[PDB]
From a paper:
In this study, we identified a [name]/[name] transcription regulator [name] of [name] SJTD‐1 involved in the negative regulation of AlkB2 and deciphered its nature of DNA binding and ligand release. The long‐chain fatty acyl coenzyme A compounds can release [name] and stimulate transcription of alkB2, reflecting the effect of alkane catabolic metabolites. Structural insights unveiled that the arginine residues and scaffold residues of [name] are critical for DNA binding.
The DNA binding domain of [name] protein is characterized by the presence of two β‐strands (β1 and β2) and three α‐helices (α1 to α3). The helix–turn–helix motif, formed by α2 and α3, is linked to the anti‐parallel β‐strands (β1 and β2) via a small loop (wing motif). The C‐terminal domain contributes to the secondary structure of [name] protein with six additional helices (α4 to α9), which are indicative of [name] protein classification within the [name]‐group regulators belonging to the FCD subfamily of the [name] superfamily. A chemical cross‐linking assay with sulfo‐EGS showed that [name] protein is predominantly in the dimer form in solution, consistent with the results of size exclusion chromatography. In this work, the Apo‐form structure of [name] dimers revealed that the Arg45 and Arg49 are involved in interactions with the major groove of DNA, by forming hydrogen bonds with specific DNA bases. This interaction is likely pivotal for the recognition and binding of [name] protein to its specific DNA motif, and removal of the side chains of arginine resulted in the decreased DNA affinity of [name] protein. Specifically, residues I63 and G68 in [name] protein are situated on the linker of the flexible minor groove insertion sequence, potentially acting as a scaffold of this region for stabilization by hydrogen bonding via their side chains.
Residue numbers in the entry:
A (entry chain A), B (entry chain A): 7 to 63, 68 to 219
Amino acid sequence: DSLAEQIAHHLAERIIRGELKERERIQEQKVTQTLNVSRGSVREALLILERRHLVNIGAQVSELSPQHVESLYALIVQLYILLAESVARRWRSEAELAPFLVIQQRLLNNLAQSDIDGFVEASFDIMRAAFPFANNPYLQETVENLLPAVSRAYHLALERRKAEMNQFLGSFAQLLQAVIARDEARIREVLLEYGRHNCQLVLAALAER
Amino acid sequence: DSLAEQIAHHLAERIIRGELKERERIQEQKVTQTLNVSRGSVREALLILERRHLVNIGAQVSELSPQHVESLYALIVQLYILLAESVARRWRSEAELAPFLVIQQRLLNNLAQSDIDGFVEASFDIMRAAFPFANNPYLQETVENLLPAVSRAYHLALERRKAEMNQFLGSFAQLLQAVIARDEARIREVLLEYGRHNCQLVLAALAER
């Protein structure tokens, strides 16, 4: 990771968690002083965040809107189907799926700790554990570039409804079983159904701003 | 467009057209001298090309492989379906589809001129004319970031088979009619069928390297 990428990750986590609010301003000099970093690094960090849709170029934290949320979910669900179908076709031995079981345990541990921040962080390891099965650089880079925006929406859904962690775990368990069963019709059903549900929960939160 | 983006577009067109070959080296100083540009601009231009999958960081033009070609087509077909379905649902008056008819004429004009380079260039205006219907920044930026790689593969298919221009036009006409008919099942059929056909033509060319 370049220093620009480290700074962007730091600011992205603050936007994702709701610590930096919609329309809030980010000043280059304030970030340089708080983090003890070079100004050029901060400038590049903001360009990364803009590329990842989290800020508008100083910079201002981007606003959420229903059309962009719906846009994001319509796209990410098709990318997740592609990833999950590649795991379902390519896994050869059940040992290769063990990463998903460890993530299941990590999600449960964060739920036990009432840790929404860690729950979101661990959710993204699911995609990361799928990448070696797909060996698809275009898909991987696309998903990685969208993870901050997805994170931000997903975090808002959990801020609105803690029981969504229980809901996600139930759907994830169904997805894992469908991948184990190599059932592509069921994989698409689970992802499309949970995707629409989670999107509408984000929209409910947006409507209450 | 920044100067870095202009330089990257210039080098991308040379890779897309086959003027810069797989594994060929690009030297920063050679580009600065040929184009009369700043070295920092060229350095950033290469980072753009690497982000767009056209070079590995000097830099070397990336190699094509069957798994990456299949990866690219599996992804881009789902993105095209998303775009085409949004046009099919959102167009209100047939005047709004006129851009696609003009592109049809431009494709025919390049075919008449035996201009594969211009045919590829005009093909990408189809996606660009679809963006206002989708109003989907995530989808738009994803497609824009993949257009150079798609371009390169598509250009190789036409270098292998000029009659593919006639084939593309026939399929495009069917897609436009399905969009006019707001028939989403037919939209997916046309894009999936042409996608698999064009992908296998690229694979045929790869096998003959």
